[PDB]
């Protein structure tokens, strides 16, 4: 079960901006769950400016709680292409992010998809 | 005299990004000015994210009212390190605009220099 989710700015550099999240899960399985990795995808107002996979092991011990951080990588070059559809739509952004962890019980999988809608605006001028 | 200031978003691509000023001026001499071009800064939290000069010359008759067209333009490379500056102040950013237009009356001139402070606040996470 999910009990929390929490971003939070990452390392942000000139060519790259990440997003951490961290979420708090609890196995309430007799067996230990092992998330493999997970693949994300943030799309602004259609454009897809990140799309990647992060190959990072964890296992959740059976009857325990534990936080999993998520580290999303936004590619600027795509971001710069966002900034168009930005302010042709009247400086209003549609955000989707979907994070799509591999569950690992058994080669066998079970592969969910989390997504989270947002909105903002800017009033710049 | 300036009588209005009217600011809009211009031509933006992936590559730059411009900002056009509609300046309404009235002349209140009795011979006519001519504004040979301007020189303009855009600075975001003490990044430098625009500073150009364009030389288009342009009169105003005398006891006569027109409309200035200033473009504004952003290189994205320098927009892209006011990000990291962004974030770091909790998504504030205070921005500096000024421009510096070149007034000839006789290779003698007047170099005003007009600034506009504004700021703004994300709220993205």
Known sequence: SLESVKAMWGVVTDSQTEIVALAKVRNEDVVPIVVSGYHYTIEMNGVKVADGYENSPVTVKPASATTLKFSLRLNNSFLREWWVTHIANGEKTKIRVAIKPTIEIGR?????????????????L
């Not at 999988?109 to 009033?123: G, I």
């Open 108 to 124: 066998d999988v079970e592969v969910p998809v989390f997504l989270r809608e947002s909105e903002f605006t800017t009033k710049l």
